[PDB]
Symmetry: C2
Subunit: 221 residues, 2 copies
Amino acid sequence: DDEFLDMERKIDVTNKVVAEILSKTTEYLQPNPAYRAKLGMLNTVSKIRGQVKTTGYPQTEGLLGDCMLKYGKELGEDSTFGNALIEVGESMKLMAEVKDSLDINVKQTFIDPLQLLQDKDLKEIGHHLKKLEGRRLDYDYKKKRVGEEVRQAVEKFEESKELAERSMFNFLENDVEQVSQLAVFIEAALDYHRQSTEILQELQSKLQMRISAASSVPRRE
Amino acid sequence: DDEFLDMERKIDVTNKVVAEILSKTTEYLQPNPAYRAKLGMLNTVSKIRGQVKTTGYPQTEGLLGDCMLKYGKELGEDSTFGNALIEVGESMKLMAEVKDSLDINVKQTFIDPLQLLQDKDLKEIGHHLKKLEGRRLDYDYKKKRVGKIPDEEVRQAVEKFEESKELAERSMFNFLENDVEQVSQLAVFIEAALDYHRQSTEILQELQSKLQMRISAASSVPR
């Protein structure tokens, strides 16, 4: 009955992390409350929606991209800054899709998975623990003489007791499944950073050249 | 005199561009309004006794890492998931530290310099033009009164009006001629985001290597 209390506190900790990792992650994607979907919407596992943001939100990078492009054009094709702006905004727009993906890939590939874990094994463990605890109470009170009752009460207490140790031990003997999940997250985060590097590197060059050409001519005084 | 009016429309767009980049950049760094302010105050630290770049605010990556550290240890020295959770949380701590540098460095080398372009170069120009509206409004006054006032009454009204138009003109010209320097400021910015992503890719990988082993060693085991 000791292991029990110990395996329990562990699933108990397991629960706290899943929720926490979920919110902390979901937040990592959209730090701004204004552009972070309702929890109700983020609580659904949509195999056709990885959206973590609110309908239409261009993503920060997109907003930084639109303005550089709008105003860069206004400045005319004769201004080095306006033309560079158009190129930088162009890049920023492509930086918004690479982010849209990070969001999506993490929603459906890491968050929803941790959610199915919540809605299945954990919830199941819960009822096994909740039924048990309940079975445990009606027995204490009853084991002090009633009137076929004391009988099928104990047998009910054991069923629920083992059944609670089964699914619970068979989960704390699972671990590795959750660890593989984490990995799925790091992988998704990896493309986002590598792909964001490639775009920025491209832009970096496109800008290093513009400066050079413009700098190899004596600016009018 | 559009050659003039064209230069004004430009300097006009510039500010709209500049101010917009200042807010969008800031929101980029800190989507969460709670720390946008705590970000415009960031200073570069001296490192005589260590390299600690404090921020004054958490980074999402840091938050997340904390939760994994806290419950990972709580799980148990024997738990595989907690053991993995601890290692992953630690990485998150570096991810955060790298985030702090993007904030600081973009603030220092892109936002402050760009705010400076406002508080000085664009201000000086906004001023000369404002100064010219007066001469131009005054000029047109004495002009509407030729024959009703001295000869120097209108002659001066033009000089200070032309000596001004040329001041606002020459001033707009120089700024628009060195915008090369601004594409240069954008280059300092991209360099910042660029650096930040690579050092992030560097951390993630190190961890992914360790995670595989962890997952492998946890499966190539008896039950």
